[PDB]
Design a protein around this ligand. Structure first.
Ligand SMILES: Cc1cc2nc3c(=O)[nH]c(=O)nc-3n(C[C@H](O)[C@H](O)[C@H](O)COP(=O)(O)OP(=O)(O)OC[C@H]3O[C@@H](n4cnc5c(N)ncnc54)[C@H](O)[C@@H]3O)c2cc1C
Ligand SMILES: Cc1cc2nc3c(=O)[nH]c(=O)nc-3n(C[C@H](O)[C@H](O)[C@H](O)COP(=O)(O)OP(=O)(O)OC[C@H]3O[C@@H](n4cnc5c(N)ncnc54)[C@H](O)[C@@H]3O)c2cc1C
Ligand SMILES: N[C@@H](CCNC(=O)[C@@H](CSSC[C@@H](NC(=O)CC(=O)O)C(=O)NCC[C@H](N)C(=O)O)NC(=O)CC(=O)O)C(=O)O
Ligand SMILES: N[C@@H](CCNC(=O)[C@@H](CSSC[C@@H](NC(=O)CC(=O)O)C(=O)NCC[C@H](N)C(=O)O)NC(=O)CC(=O)O)C(=O)O
Lengths: 461, 461
């Protein structure tokens, strides 16, 4: 039984960040990883995603070429070119991560970990046992797929994982889901030339975003050539002579349900949710609490119900983002190895960027949420809508929408919501301001940067 | 003698903003304007500049086309196309501004104003007299040109004004100056295909920026194809059979001076400074104080030395930016018409973006300035340099450099300096944070947005 100061199960965003910081603090740590370092973000997430988005972005900017004085650019996108390059880039990161572990003196135990029956918390990986007085579960999640029992042929469609394995651009594609992944994927497939549909169960996407964003986002999708099938759901999938045929039920409220076949589908992509990867851990041998989705339950300090067993990131099922796993794994190393008992992540005011076209940035409360927290009489919002100066000379147009939610008399800024060109890079510092508790006077007393999009947030009236 | 509550001399950024706010407060105001509303920014500045930069930006992104999966884009930029469109856009703004005045009930007195000999401060425009108990001088500045007496043939070159009148793309161009305008113009001419030189009297551009920025900026210029002639200056200009021929002295220190002829120059562009437009105001009839450059002297509240005569913006010669004229003209309307005696602009922490390639964002103190204000032992800086993920798959590369200057133990952030893709839109909110007095813990406690460039500012170590 080899013993360590800290054993980390999962070599992804959270596990790596935690192990690394712990090691700086003097801990003798090991990372168990059964697949590739970097975990979801690097391999099939954030990274290969952003590369594909920058690719889609080139496709749209190239539509503006002629408007800008140049001669029309003519053609066909070549998927394999960028795919090979994207893959290589991911290979490059994997080796950097591996080296990071090494320089830190972190041991890497390769293989699939599971808890044992043993009294003191202990895992087994490939017949060997390992133990530590602090064990971190950071095994993340996976794409959820439907059961053939509820939707026959569900297994003919792919997930975001499968999207990263594609070798050619699908001629016809149908995406099911209304979350950010769904949105992002529909936007990349479309810009790249796939004839794309987004199948959503209601009337808008991103329904948990401020309603200014779900509305604006649904429109921009449509304007960009994406067909959003509202109130629709898949009833069955079948392999036809040439692709797939998707049977769907459309149930607009106040209308009779209607069934439609969607034929000649090259790509059916499920973007319906994520499930926690806890199934094969043998948790129950220690009685670790999970919820009914298989999520590990933790407290504000990332503790599980069992002493010296913690969990961070996706597995815990809250705020499914890479920087949140990182921040939580980092605060936890300080708490365990630097004895900072108050060290924990504040889950409020986490900012998100959705890589749509135009991208989306959001931090803090939606208008509704502020209304529920402070009361209608104590919530005031400010907003603006304009056409970015980039489009002053184009025929193609996009819009920029910004919304600021304030609370109480002081007009404390509790929420910033926007969509528009540049909004991916504009977010970070307002998110700092929002964390510090700024009010609207603070924003207003900041001299504007002209001409930009970002100056609109500081000149709202 | 028509009387008003507020007479504004100048219909540019500062004069318009001041007149408008004053009118909301109940004042009966008139704007005197001898040219076009919008003043320098709209007509020959910020606006036509940004349009041309977005144009240059298309030129560079089009170099990356093939790397991204697409087929090479082949060609020739057409200057007249974009120029016509740019002009129309400016026409569009002029009419909006005019309408803004109108809806506000601001009277527009068209023509050139000058003070009179009269005891109570009074101006004359086209034989008629006008007066008010509060008069705002906001007549801005103009491009400085050399005297034929010091540099013979100086008059064969043009200024930034003339740049906006050009109808074709100059085949060979030489820019003189090392300030932001100079930089911006060299970057636009170059990207658009002009064979461009930047003639600077020292070894770096933007010498008043943090030294990380002047160095990085000089390099990026070179890497982008701009020839920076260091320690050089123009000795004479002459009209040859085919263009201009520029005689220059190059005086590298520790070396003998060397004289060079630069032949076949299509465009010689002076970007050497700006002079205040006060010459034709008859100031001296009221004894209004100016400095020896013709700048109007004011105090922290924008007062001149004469009661009920104020000055804002470029004419005053400090912080030559559109949003500063605006903020000062606005604070002044509140002070005069809303009786807020403490209403004035804080000139610290004004942020700037330089529209270079990649753009530059800066707010607060340079490393040197913090060193002088707090002492070497109390200044700590943090910085990073990396290749933005956009270039992971290109052959062409640019870099991103960020620097954070902190002071005292608390590590108060007194300065942020960066250069890189996205840096034009990233600045605004950090500038809010810097205005609020944030420290580095504040930045550090903000959850990062991944994958972006902006997340680097919040993960500095
Ligand atoms: C398509 C897509 C795009 C995304 N885009 C972004 C984005 O742009 N920005 C962002 O912030 N987030 C994004 N996310 C979310 C982000 O990827 C996740 O929040 C993040 O990866 C969660 O990290 P984690 O540390 O919990 O686990 P993961 O990163 O999933 O790592 C868990 C690791 O555990 C290993 N493992 C699991 N079980 C075991 C076991 N029993 N033994 C050993 N090893 C094991 C797995 O192989 C894996 O490497 C995206 C996600 C997806 C799917
Ligand atoms: C090439 C260039 C690019 C620039 N880019 C930017 C940028 O991107 N961002 C930025 O923030 N700043 C930029 N600037 C700076 C910005 O344009 C100036 O700071 C700003 O215009 C100053 O405004 P102002 O109100 O003092 O005067 P101005 O805007 O110059 O207006 C003064 C007005 O007074 C009128 N006038 C003058 N004398 C009289 C008189 N006697 N009677 C009647 N009318 C009179 C003039 O016609 C004019 O319209 C740029 C400047 C230039 C030259
Ligand atoms: N800052 C933005 C665009 C800002 N403005 C617009 O698109 C104007 C079209 S023209 S209004 C002047 C626009 N600016 C210029 O060209 C101005 C300039 O040269 O300063 C503008 O509103 N600029 C920003 C001023 C700032 N928001 C303030 O209040 O200080 N319409 C709206 O804001 C919607 C509305 O309120 O009707 C950008 O650079 O893309
Ligand atoms: N955030 C930037 C790029 C960031 N990183 C780099 O270019 C890495 C090349 S790889 S290091 C991992 C780079 N990221 C990923 O691909 C990571 C991911 O998938 O999270 C990275 O450093 N990401 C940001 C993590 C963050 N800055 C933190 O400290 O939390 N080199 C440096 O930062 C320079 C150095 O310190 O040697 C972007 O998205 O362009």
């Amino acid at each position: 039984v080899a013993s360590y100061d800290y054993l980390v199960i999962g070599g992804g965003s959270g596990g790596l960040a935690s192990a690394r910081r712990a090691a700086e603090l003097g801990a003798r740590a090991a990372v168990v990883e059964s697949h590739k370092l970097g975990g979801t973000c690097v391999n099939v997430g954030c990274v290969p995603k952003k590369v594909m988005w920058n690719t889609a972005v080139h496709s749209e900017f190239m539509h503006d070429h002629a408007d800008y004085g140049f001669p029309s650019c003519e053609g066909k996108f070549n998927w394999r070119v960028i795919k090979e390059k994207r893959d290589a880039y991911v290979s490059r990161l994997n080796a950097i991560y591996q080296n990071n572990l090494t320089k830190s003196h972190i041991e890497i135990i390769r293989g699939h970990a599971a808890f044992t029956s043993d009294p003191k918390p202990t895992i087994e990986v490939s017949g060997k046992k390992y133990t530590a007085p602090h064990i971190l579960i950071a095994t993340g999640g996976m794409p959820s797929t439907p059961h053939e029992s509820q939707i026959p042929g569900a297994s003919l469609g792919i997930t975001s994982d499968g999207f990263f394995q594609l070798e050619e651009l699908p001629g016809r594609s149908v995406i099911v889901g209304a979350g950010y992944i769904a949105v992002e994927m529909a936007g990349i497939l479309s810009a790249l030339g796939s004839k794309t549909s987004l199948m959503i169960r209601h009337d808008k996407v991103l329904r948990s975003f401020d309603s200014m964003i779900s509305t604006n986002c649904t429109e921009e999708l449509e304007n960009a050539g994406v067909e959003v099938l509202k109130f629709s759901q898949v009833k069955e999938v079948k392999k036809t002579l040439s692709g797939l045929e998707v049977s769907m039920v459309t149930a607009v409220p106040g209308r009779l349900p209607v069934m439609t076949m969607i034929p000649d589908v090259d790509c059916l992509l499920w973007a319906i949710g994520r499930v926690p990867n806890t199934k094969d851990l043998s948790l129950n041998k220690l009685g670790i609490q999970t919820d009914d989705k298989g999520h590990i339950i933790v407290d504000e300090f990332q503790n599980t119900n069992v002493k010296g067993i913690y969990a961070v990131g996706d597995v815990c099922g809250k705020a499914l983002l890479t920087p949140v796993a990182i921040a939580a794994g980092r605060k936890l190393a300080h708490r365990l190895f630097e004895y900072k008992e108050d060290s924990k992540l504040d889950y409020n005011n986490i900012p998100t960027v959705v890589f749509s076209h135009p991208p989306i940035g959001t931090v803090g409360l939606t208008e509704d949420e502020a209304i529920h927290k402070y009361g209608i009489e104590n919530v005031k919002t400010y907003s603006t809508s304009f056409t970015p100066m980039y489009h002053a000379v184009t025929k193609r147009k996009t819009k920029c929408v910004m919304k600021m939610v304030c609370a109480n008399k002081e007009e404390k800024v509790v929420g910033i919501h926007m969509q528009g060109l540049g909004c991916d890079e504009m977010l970070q510092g307002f998110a700092v301001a929002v964390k510090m508790g700024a009010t609207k006077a603070d924003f207003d007393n900041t001299v504007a940067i002209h001409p930009t999009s970002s100056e609109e947030l500081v000149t709202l009236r």
